[PDB]
Write a protein that binds this DNA or RNA. Structure first.
Ligand SMILES: Nc1nc2c(ncn2[C@H]2C[C@H](O)[C@@H](COP(=O)(O)NP(=O)(O)OP(=O)(O)O)O2)c(=O)[nH]1
Ligand SMILES: [Mg+2]
Ligand SMILES: [Mn+2]
Ligand SMILES: [Mn+2]
Length: 539
DNA sequence: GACCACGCACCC
DNA sequence: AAACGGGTGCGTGGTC
């Protein structure tokens, strides 16, 4: 390309180099743009940001986030990553997309700008005639990248003093647990080393081994194995408690307070838009989509996520979303009727599991029932089911039969989906998002059936992801107009922040947007709560 | 310091 | 652990 002076004309493709991957923390080392056979390199990248009207190119959102961090409203535009991701969601990295569609991902901004321009041309050509993928690009993914940029740059408030104090309390309990484990073992060892623990449990204490690990075939010490040995030896209970506390302390309590951004005073995640095989987002650096919630200590951690003073959090979560999506995709008349009647399949399974009235189903029971319902739907074996519920094999097998017999068009839809995936090589969501699953014709049954479970899961999970993304795109401008903020997405959940005086109106509006985003054969219902912290906002 | 593979625990 | 699916992060153990 012909080198030309900064600035570029409108519409040019940008390239940029960051000191580190996280745009809220990165130094902008270099900036360039490409257009019309020319490449323009910025003499000083920070000041040069002011000259761009739009971030157009590879990883556009990340540059937008850094721009917003610097007080500049630079929206992301076209991004070849999003085109490639829609053609094939195994396209997750700029390294791979470049090699696949016509260039090389280097560490030079000018080359990244030229690469962005070339890949856009080629990928746009590949999408010619792919009208449904183009709709997803123009109506979902490209607009969503601007929404995600704002979310990332906004961040969430965290009670750091609370977590610092909690760390000290948990440390004293961990010491109690580890001392007791070492006493029971008859000697100390590194309780964090599962290789050392394996020897203690199965060689020294002679406990029965229950299962093997996947890659190396060691005797497993995982929670599922420990729970089966709960009554074999008192050390097991102490190990399980140690495992929970150290996981929670090492992954959430201790690291998160150290990640508060000095300019914003908030915690900033990344919402990765080309990272999953189904069209879901992921979250990283830190992941704010796996914050604890199930146990009492996990709930204490979730309470650390708080609203700004004068504001409230609003949490919205789709009811039984993938079961509702399944009703629409399969067209099963009975399952459609279940939700037209306002029934709750998780609560109903929980009532049966624990043998108590629906009135008596607490959140832990419903959570356990959720796992059973989706486990069974997506191919859980009768053997594992019998083991999960502590019930005879014949009973577990009968539960599965009753599950599917109730909704006969589901199995028909599954077999239709698999046959189509075999013939086409890909399955697709309601909106046409594709996942390629070539192993559907593998000659090794274990490999083939694993591919099958991946394949017929994707239209369900992926359609739910499409709906959530579309809802975010529609909701974001409404929140801006109301002075409210979108903070987090957790797959079928949004966490908003609203001024106290408008929180009720925001909750009502967001619920209506989410419920009416794209009507299905079944109503979409959204549970909504308001509170000063994330846990209290989920009722 | 970095990378990785792995087992394991976090959530939807 | 197992014929549920989709993810990320930590510590260990090994390596460079
Ligand atoms: N295959 C699979 N999918 C899962 C699992 N857990 C969650 N998902 C998928 C399927 C879920 O539909 C979706 C959202 O998870 P929730 O919001 O925690 N549960 P839901 O929306 O069903 O019920 P409600 O909100 O009324 O309590 O994520 C699981 O164990 N397995
Ligand atoms: Mg204390
Ligand atoms: Mn839900
Ligand atoms: Mn949810």
């Amino acid at each position: 390309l012909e080198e030309a002076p900064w600035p570029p004309p409108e519409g040019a493709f940008v390239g940029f180099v960051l000191s580190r991957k996280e745009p809220m923390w990165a130094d902008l080392l270099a900036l360039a743009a490409a257009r019309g056979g020319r490449v323009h390199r910025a003499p000083e990248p920070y000041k040069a940001l002011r000259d761009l009207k739009e971030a157009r190119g590879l990883l556009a959102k990340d540059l937008s986030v850094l721009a917003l961090r610097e007080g500049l409203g630079l929206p992301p535009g076209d991004d070849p990553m999003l085109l490639a991701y829609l053609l094939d969601p195994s396209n997750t990295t700029p390294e791979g997309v470049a090699r696949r569609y016509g260039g090389e991902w280097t560490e030079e901004a000018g080359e990244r700008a030229a690469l962005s321009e070339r890949l856009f041309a080629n990928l746009w050509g590949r999408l010619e005639g792919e009208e449904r993928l183009l709709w997803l690009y123009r109506e979902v993914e490209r607009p969503l990248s601007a929404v995600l940029a704002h979310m990332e740059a906004t961040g969430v408030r965290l009670d750091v003093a609370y977590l610092r104090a909690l760390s000290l309390e948990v440390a004293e309990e961990i010491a109690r647990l580890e001392a007791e484990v070492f006493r029971l073992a008859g000697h100390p060892f590194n309780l964090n080393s599962r290789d050392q623990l394996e020897r203690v449990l199965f060689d020294e204490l002679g406990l029965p081994a229950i299962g093997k690990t996947e890659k190396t075939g060691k005797r497993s010490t995982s929670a599922a194995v420990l729970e089966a040995l709960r009554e074999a030896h008192p050390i097991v209970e102490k190990i399980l408690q140690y495992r929970e506390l150290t996981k929670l302390k090492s992954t959430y309590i201790d690291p998160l307070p150290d990640l508060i951004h000095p300019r914003t005073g908030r915690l900033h995640t990344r919402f990765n838009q080309t990272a999953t095989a189904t069209g879901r987002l992921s979250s990283s650096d830190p992941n704010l989509q796996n914050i604890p919630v199930r146990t009492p200590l996990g709930q204490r951690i979730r309470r650390a996520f708080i609203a700004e003073e004068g504001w409230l959090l609003v949490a919205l979560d789709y009811s039984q979303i993938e079961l509702r999506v399944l009703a629409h995709l399969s067209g099963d008349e009975n399952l459609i009727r279940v939700f037209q009647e306002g029934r709750d399949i998780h609560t109903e399974t929980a009532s049966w599991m624990f043998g108590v009235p629906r009135e008596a189903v607490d959140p832990l029971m419903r959570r356990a029932a959720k796992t059973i319902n989706f486990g069974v739907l997506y191919g859980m074996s009768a053997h594992r089911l019998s083991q999960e519920l502590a019930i005879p094999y014949e009973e577990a097998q009968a539960f599965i039969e009753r599950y599917f017999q109730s909704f006969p068009k589901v199995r028909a839809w599954i077999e239709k989906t698999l046959e189509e995936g075999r013939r086409r090589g890909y399955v697709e969501t309601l909106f046409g998002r594709r996942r390629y699953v070539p192993d559907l014709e593998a000659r090794v049954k274990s490999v083939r059936e694993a591919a099958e479970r991946m394949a017929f899961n994707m239209p369900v999970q992926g359609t739910a992801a499409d709906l959530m993304k579309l809802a975010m795109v529609k909701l974001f401008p409404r929140l801006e107009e109301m002075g409210a903020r979108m903070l987090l997405q957790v797959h079928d959940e949004l966490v908003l922040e609203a001024p106290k005086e408008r929180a009720e109106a925001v909750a009502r509006l967001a619920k209506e947007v989410m419920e009416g985003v794209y009507p299905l054969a079944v109503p979409l219902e959204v549970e909504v709560g308001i509170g000063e912290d994330w846990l209290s906002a989920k009722e």
